[PDB]
């Protein structure tokens, strides 16, 4: 007969203004990861905030983000050229998806990217952004490998000296404002919601209502949708237990 969206009570605003508006985004091989928790995340505000050339959300619709509570939200941010933006997705292959940043096949979160040619491209060439180019094995999901040791591509050992069959693993991009549209830096921000809902700490605004007992209600307890009659019970719940099932 009525809905009762009884979310946890918290008023902190998630620092999406400190991950999407950072002056410097980390290099793709050393992508910054920020764990966001204990705050209210207004994903609609960040959705309609700029010109996001790519807002692919995998496993959850962008509009439904305000109606869910997530256990952990990670904001992996980096800078990638235009042609390699497509490689930031599950089931992708290439230098970016294997040597720099690997998204798991069970990825659950949004992938956000916008063409930032006014901040990460300089006339002489911006070489602060480096992508790994040679590695022994492809990266496991969500792994950062910032080792700059010379990769031995031949039988003869390199012994830390680059030369024949010895190359430096990291190669710069060198963005310029007159580069191609597919060769401009795209400041990617990959949100990875840890969809567990048990210690749900990041939530949408979703103004709560008063709990209604002993009547058929369309409850929305902490992101656990359904329908039933919420009756107070004498269940011996432990302090660290949220839902019984």
């Amino acid at each position, epitope marked *: 007969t009525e809905s009762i969206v009884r979310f946890p009570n918290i008023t902190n605003l998630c620092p999406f203004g400190e991950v999407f508006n950072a002056t410097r985004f980390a290099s793709v091989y050393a992508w910054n990861r920020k764990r966001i928790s204990n705050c209210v995340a207004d994903y609609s505000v960040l959705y309609n905030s700029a010109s996001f050339s790519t807002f692919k959300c995998y496993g959850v619709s962008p509009t439904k983000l305000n109606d869910l509570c997530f256990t952990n939200v990670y904001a992996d941010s980096f800078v990638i050229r235009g042609d390699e933006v497509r490689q930031i997705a599950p089931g992708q292959t290439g230098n970016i998806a294997d040597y720099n940043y690997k998204l798991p096949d069970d990825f659950t979160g949004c992938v956000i990217a916008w063409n930032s040619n006014n*901040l990460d491209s300089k006339v*002489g060439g911006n*070489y602060n952004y*480096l992508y790994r180019l040679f590695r022994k094995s492809n990266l496991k999901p969500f792994e950062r490998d910032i080792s700059t040791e010379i990769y031995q591509a031949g039988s003869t050992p390199c012994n830390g000296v680059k030369g024949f069959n010895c190359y430096f693993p990291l*190669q*710069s991009y060198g963005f310029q404002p007159t580069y191609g549209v597919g060769y401009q830096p795209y400041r990617v921000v990959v949100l990875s919601f840890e969809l567990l809902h048990a210690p749900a700490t990041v939530c949408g605004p979703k103004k709560s209502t008063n709990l209604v007992k002993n009547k058929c209600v369309n409850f929305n307890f902490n992101g656990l949708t359904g329908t039933g009659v919420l009756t107070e019970s004498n269940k011996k719940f432990l302090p660290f237990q949220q839902f019984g099932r």
Partner: antibody
Amino acid sequence: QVQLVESGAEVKKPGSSVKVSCKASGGNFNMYTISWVRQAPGRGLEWMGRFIPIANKANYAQNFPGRVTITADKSTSTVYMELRSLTSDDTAVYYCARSGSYDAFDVWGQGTMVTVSS
Amino acid sequence: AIRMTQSPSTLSASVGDRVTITCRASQTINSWLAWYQQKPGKAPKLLIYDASNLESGVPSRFSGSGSGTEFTLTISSLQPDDFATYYCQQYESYSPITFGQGTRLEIK
């Protein structure tokens, strides 16, 4: 503690050429770019060129067309900046600066005083 | 080529006062701008980078602000050791990087 050491003072004649050095000691030489900054007496600083070890490229200032040719020996982590066609207005201390981490010249060399006169 | 302009070119102040230096660009260089300090006979040392941060080891009295085309360096409590020439870099175009004309700070 990265330390940059340059060559000694040089005295040349107008119309000749000079070539200074900048020995990069410590850290990783393959990532940070070395930028050469000159300062004529009584005047502000002036930028000359950049050596980009990661891309193995060298850039020169627009005001110096072909006058500056920057090379380096990555084996010994030594950067050489060559200035051609010295004149009376090129008497300046030629610093070498390491635009590390945040593109700013955090580490500056001791600077060599290059004097061009008869 | 982006041209940088400083103001005032020559300034004088006493110990413990407040000093403001304005280095205005000609084009939008976002927030890419660094502030140096060159005591005579020494190599300039970095003070501010990205136009607002503070370089490690720099005394906290140095503070920078501004973005776009006009920037500003300010010293909360001027000290005798802080009398030198302050330059502003514009590392938004690497062809060519243009320093400021130089702001010499003198004892009043």
